[PDB]
Design a protein around this ligand. Structure first.
Ligand SMILES: *[C@@H]1O[C@H](CO)[C@@H](O[C@@H]2O[C@H](CO)[C@@H](O)[C@H](O)[C@H]2NC(C)=O)[C@H](O)[C@H]1NC(C)=O
Ligand SMILES: *[C@@H]1O[C@H](CO)[C@@H](O[C@@H]2O[C@H](CO)[C@@H](O)[C@H](O)[C@H]2NC(C)=O)[C@H](O)[C@H]1NC(C)=O
Lengths: 48, 49
């Protein structure tokens, strides 16, 4: 059945968690770092 | 670089409480290097006037 196969294939995808624990944690760390850099980055005047 | 501290709440708390040579040196040097250097051309004129 293609419907059952569709649902099972949507549910079976590993996504992340195929990596190690060290590697997964490092990935989440750099994701959060990039997001926070983008969100709170600041530039200021050259003369004030 | 997104963690900037003012003088009153936060720099002269490092300077009063900390016991880390490197952190004290960082605070002491950076306060005079980043804010002290902006006041030199103004002080030179203040003296004359
Ligand atoms: C397995 O596939 C069949 C058809 O290939 C599905 O049969 C349909 O079932 C729904 C309700 O269960 C009906 O509204 C359709 O009219 C049926 N189609 C046909 C062609 O008879 C069946 O549902 C599938 N299995 C599951 C669990 O959904
Ligand atoms: C999803 O990840 C697992 C490992 O986390 C993959 O490895 C299989 O996992 C199943 C379930 O424990 C075992 O029965 C198999 O022996 C494992 N090895 C295989 C299949 O070579 C799994 O293949 C991944 N699934 C998908 C769809 O990528």
């Amino acid at each position: 059945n293609l419907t059952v196969k569709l649902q099972l294939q949507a549910l079976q995808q590993n996504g992340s968690s195929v990596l190690s624990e060290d590697k997964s944690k490092r990935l989440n760390t750099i994701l959060n770092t990039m997001s926070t850099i983008y969100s709170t980055g600041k530039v200021c005047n050259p003369d004030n | 670089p997104q963690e900037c501290l003012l003088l009153e709440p936060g720099l002269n708390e490092i300077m009063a409480n900390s016991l880390d040579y490197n952190e004290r040196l960082w605070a002491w040097e950076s306060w005079r290097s980043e804010v002290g250097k902006q006041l030199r051309p103004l002080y030179e004129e203040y003296v004359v006037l």
